[PDB]
Amino acid sequence: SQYALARTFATQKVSLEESVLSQVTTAIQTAQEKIVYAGNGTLSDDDRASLATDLQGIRDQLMNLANSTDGNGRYIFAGYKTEAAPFDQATGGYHGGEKSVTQQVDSAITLEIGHTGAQIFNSICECAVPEPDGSDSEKNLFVMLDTAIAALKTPVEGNNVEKEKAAAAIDKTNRGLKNSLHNVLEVRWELEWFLELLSAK
């Protein structure tokens, strides 16, 4: 019969997620800009290690966003497991809830108002760019970042075998960050739709 409270709760939760995912989007785009500079094979090992540090700062920001809590201190990207931070700080692994938070808002409509951290930070777009060798696309944002950061702190001057190895990891990160950004943008499209549905009452 009356969905007033349900719709206010879903508007609030969806607005919060859009607000945090907007920050995730900006941080992913900043890391992509770093990775473009890292594709320059005339960088010295000191320049490369400076880019690594910049990328660590961005990774740390994304980890703080992935472990975002709401007003009441409950984690927003953990599905129903809202009492513990869903991401492991060191590895970026997800161990929050596997089922998204849903809310019925009309006699017929139920919305996915809380996406899991797996859906946001350990998923890539349907439209993913493939690995050139046919191996699996990396799905975990933090892995993409950490593997780049490690390859940028590995000096490569005068050593072609290492130089190619480090440049292959940077290329792979460039592909992942596309794949991850596109996933977040598709989720944001879905939230934009939910807020249109909700505001039409």
Q: Which stretch binds Zn ion (CB under 5 A): 25-33, 65-73, 166-174, 187-195?
A: 187-195
Q: How far is the CB of 178 from Na ion (least distance, A)?
A: 12
Q: How far is the CB of 153 from Na ion (least distance, A)?
A: 33
Q: How far is the CB of 187 from Zn ion (least distance, A)?
A: 6
d(CA 71, CA 2): 26
Pick 162 or 190: Cβ nearer Zn ion: 190
Q: Which residue is nearest to Na ion (CB)?
A: 186
Q: Is 98 in the site for Na ion (CB under 5 A)?
A: no
d(CA 118, CA 137): 15
Which of 13, 111, 112, 194: binder of Zn ion (CB under 5 A)?
112
Q: Which does 190 bind (CB under 5 to 8 A by kind): Zn ion, Na ion, none?
A: Zn ion
d(CA 201, CA 194): 11
Closest to 31 (Cα-Cα) out of 148, 130, 163:
148
Q: Is 186 in the site for Na ion (CB under 5 A)?
A: yes
Query: How many residues contact Zn ion, by CB under 5 A?
Result: 2
Q: Which does 186 bind (CB under 5 to 8 A by kind): Zn ion, Na ion, none?
A: Na ion
Pick 60 or 186: Cβ nearer Na ion: 186
Q: Which residues of 26-62 are buried (b: 16+ CB within 10 A; e: fewer)?
A: ebbebbbebbeebeeeebeeeebeebbebbbebbebb
Is there a contact between 31 and 145 (Cβ–Cβ < 8 Å)?
yes
Among positions 116-135, residues that touch Na ion (CB under 5 A) are 127
Q: Is 157 in the site for Na ion (CB under 5 A)?
A: no
Burial class (CB in 10 A: 0-12, 13-18, 19+), 135: exposed
β-pairing, 101-104 vs 110-114, is: antiparallel
Q: How far is the CB of 33 from Zn ion (least distance, A)?
A: 27
Pick 112 or 138: Cβ nearer Zn ion: 112
Q: For residue 72, what are its two tokens?
A: 């009441």
Question: Residues in the site for Na ion, rule: CB under 5 A?
Answer: 127, 186
Question: Residues in the site for Zn ion, rule: CB under 5 A?
Answer: 112, 190
